[PDB]
């Protein structure tokens, strides 16, 4: 029976879809707009807008399993349609922020908990995949790295443990295709905790040139982030980074435990995405 991959044009969703197609599995790729390009080959395109959960009734026909992105505003509608269609297993792309002690006050933590909890209460089989910082967050430095050798960082000494999107897709695929993952919640990290400055330098090494952070003052960083995210989220980002300033973050072996392969390094990630950081 079919697997519905929501967000099949997304960074993670497209890799989940592609990997399932490589395995011979019938995949429906969920998109908000059927007219647009970017869907991997061999995927049946279906409208599946998680904010308009009446699209889901058609998208879930003949579907046994679902990969789900976190969209809190339509979760009760999703649960209802998944139950009605006979879905047996939902794998959710959540966040490690749900595991920290302030999760239910943190905007990011709350956003993901608002989808985890109704799934937990629904009776559907589930697996939660809970990454720490996405390696792809480094793509926000591309404009500065393309144009010069200095990047401006709010907290150059702040640690995260960035995880490669391919590893996330591999864990999702394991959860969709093998037994033993029911009610599992996998906290995913990369294999090394790294500061912002270290990440920037590793991008430099992949390019063959020395790229450095300079610190920007918090006034300036707050302003930049207030143009990209709501007020509450900027406060959490900066507070999160200040709390990890000079404090190495936890490295978990969860990727290796699930997939049998060590987590991909940020260096490898930078080599994989090197074209994003070269000038036009
Ligand atoms: N950034 C971090 O450090 C971090 C850490 C932990 C967890 N996370 C989680 O990872 C996510 C990022 O995943 P990603 O890298 O794959 O992002 P992405 O490349 O931006 O893809 C996001 C996908 O979500 C889909 N989507 C959004 N709203 C939808 C809706 N209403 N209905 C259907 N599909 C919808 C989009 O579909 P369309 O392309 O069709 O529009 C898009 O394909 C975050 O949202 C968060 O939940 C992030």
Residue numbers in the entry: 1 to 280
What does the study report here?
To investigate this possibility, we determined the structures of SimC7 alone (apo; 1.6 Å resolution), the binary complex with NADP+ (1.95 Å), and the ternary complex with both NADP+ and 7-oxo-SD8 (1.2 Å). Finally, mutation of His112 (H112A, H112N, and H112Q) strongly reduced or abolished enzyme activity, consistent with its key role in binding and positioning the cofactor via a hydrogen bond to the 2′-hydroxyl of the nicotinamide ribosyl moiety. Therefore, SimC7 must be able to orient 7-oxo-SD8 for catalysis without the necessity for the hydrogen bond from Ser95, and this likely arises because the active-site cavity of the binary complex closely matches the shape of the substrate.
SimC7 is a polyketide ketoreductase involved in biosynthesis of the angucyclinone moiety of the gyrase inhibitor simocyclinone D8 (SD8). SimC7, which belongs to the short-chain dehydrogenase/reductase (SDR) superfamily, catalyzes reduction of the C-7 carbonyl of the angucyclinone, and the resulting hydroxyl is essential for antibiotic activity. SimC7 is made up of two domains, the larger of which is the nucleotide binding domain that adopts a Rossmann fold; the smaller substrate binding domain, characteristic of the so-called extended SDR subfamily (Kavanagh et al., 2008), is mainly α-helical and is largely formed by two insertions in the nucleotide binding domain (between β6 and α6, and between β9 and α10). Our results reveal that SimC7 is structurally distinct from previously characterized polyketide ketoreductases and, importantly, lacks the canonical SDR Ser-Tyr-Lys catalytic triad (Kavanagh et al., 2008, Kallberg et al., 2010, Persson and Kallberg, 2013).
